[PDB]
């Protein structure tokens, strides 16, 4: 439709192709680090508290 209405010579499909080529930066797992917390919490409850209890 744009190319139809947009009489502009090639800018229409120019940007079409360029767009289709462009790819978004997906964010990267960086917060995803405190997992040992769980396990060390697991220690506090399941090791450091299990046997004492």
């Amino acid at each position: 439709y744009y190319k139809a209405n947009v009489a502009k010579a090639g800018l229409v499909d120019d940007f079409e192709k360029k767009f289709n080529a462009l790819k978004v930066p997906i964010p990267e797992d960086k917060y995803t680090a405190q997992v040992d917390a769980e396990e060390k919490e697991d220690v506090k409850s399941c090791a450091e508290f299990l046997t004492q209890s």
């Binding site: 940007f15 360029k18 767009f19 462009l22 978004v24 930066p25 964010p27 990267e28 960086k30 917060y31």
Partner: protein, 62 residues
């Protein structure tokens, strides 16, 4: 349909006009001034970014 001379009159004024359409005939510099003003206003409503590329973003994560 050509019986009404009004139709032919309008038609061939129109034609001569289209032939003259090699440029917008008798535009007049006030035409250009109006173009100027409204084109700016349109652009500001559309922002100041260069209207030629895909303005890059480099999106920011938390």
């Amino acid at each position: 349909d050509p019986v009404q001379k009004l139709f032919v009159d309008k038609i061939r004024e129109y034609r001569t006009k289209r032939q003259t359409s090699g440029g917008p005939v008798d535009a007049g510099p006030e035409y250009q001034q109006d173009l100027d003003r409204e084109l700016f206003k349109l652009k500001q409503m559309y922002g100041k970014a260069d209207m030629n590329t895909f303005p890059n973003f480099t999106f920011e994560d938390p």
